[PDB]
Amino acid sequence: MNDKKIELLTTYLSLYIDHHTVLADMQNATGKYVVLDVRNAPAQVKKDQIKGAIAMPAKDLATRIGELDPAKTYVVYDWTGGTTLGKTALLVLLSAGFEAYELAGALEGWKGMQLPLEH
């Protein structure tokens, strides 16, 4: 019953990591995740970003991939859950053999929960 739906939902959800987990890593300084802001918009358009995030535009990821450490775990995020740069960056990383996840809720969710940002 609803086998196809369940299969897609399970694979789909496995792409993400909960913001609570990301939040605890920074508040405990456990060094578990490296947060990448993969939006392609200019800095003047982005305005703010998740606290401690690294600007790694999806369009340059391939070229700057050598900058990332293979032994770490990456979390990518875009404007919203509907934008596709999060998934695009995730695909590049997973395809490259990197351990990565997309931030559930994206930047929109983070801001909605009044979580830490920076300019």
**Binding of a second copy at residue 4 (CB under 8 A)?**
yes
User: For residues 1 and 116, what is the distance between their CA atoms, to the nearest angstrom?
Assistant: 42
Binding flag, residue 65, a second copy (CB under 8 A):
no
The amino acid that residue 101 corresponds to is Y
Residue 1 binding a second copy, by CB under 8 A = yes
What's the min distance (Å) between Cβ of 26 and a second copy?
A: 19
- What is the per-residue DSSP string for 7-72? HHHHHHHTTEE-HHHHHHHHHHT---EEEEE---S-HHHH--EETT-EE--HHHHHHHGGGS-TTS
Nearer to a second copy, 2 or 30 (CB): 2
Tell the smallest beta-carbon distance from residue 51 to a second copy (Å). 20
**Contact flags string 13-52 toward Br ion, x per CB under 5 A:** --------------------------xxx-----------
Which residue(s) pair with 68 in the sheet? none
How many other C-beta atoms are found inside a 10 Å radius of the C-beta of residue 82? 9
* Sites of contact with Br ion (CB under 5 A): 39-41
- The residues binding a second copy (CB under 8 A) are 1-2, 4-16, 79-85, 87-88, 90-91, 94-95, 97, 104-106, 108-109, 112
